[PDB]
Amino acid sequence: KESRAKKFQRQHMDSDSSPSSSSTYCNQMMRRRNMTQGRCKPVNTFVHEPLLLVQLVCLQEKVTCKNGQGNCYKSNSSMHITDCRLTNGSRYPNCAYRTSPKERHIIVACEGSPYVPVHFDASVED
């Protein structure tokens, strides 16, 4: 019953942080956003840009999704993001993550009315 739009916000939007590399940000955020409940989600990307800018990506360059579907969109601009990757030693319920801040274009799937992001598909260096 949680909307995909809301799920996408929960899993992928963190507008106001600027994590440091190999800091504790992913450990915190992966737990806070409920992605270590019952398992440690292996990899996840947070976007540090106003929700609006991510939402407007739905009107930008239309591209193919990783699954061949055609409702994917690539940001006109690079965006601050952070990649959270589970460490090798990690065993649920201890879920420890590497935090990797970077700047990349993002690609999202959009659906619905309003036409908004429902899936974070990829990021690319371009």
Q: Is residue 12 flagged as an active site residue? A: yes
Which residues are paired to 73 by β-bridges? 62, 108
**Of 48, 80, 105, 119, which is the active-site residue?**
119
Is 6 annotated as belonging to a binding site? Answer: no
Is-catalytic flag, 119?
A: yes
d(CA 84, CA 98): 6
According to the annotation, is 7 in a ligand binding site? yes
110: CB partners within 8 A, 6+ apart? 57, 58, 71, 72, 73, 116, 117, 118
Options 12, 48, 80, 105, the catalytic residue: 12
Annotated binding residue 41: yes
Q: For the chain, what's the residue count?
A: 126
10 is in an annotated binding site: yes
Per the annotation, does 44 bind a ligand? yes
Residues in binding site for substrate: 7, 10, 41-45, 66, 85
| Residues labelled catalytic | 12, 119
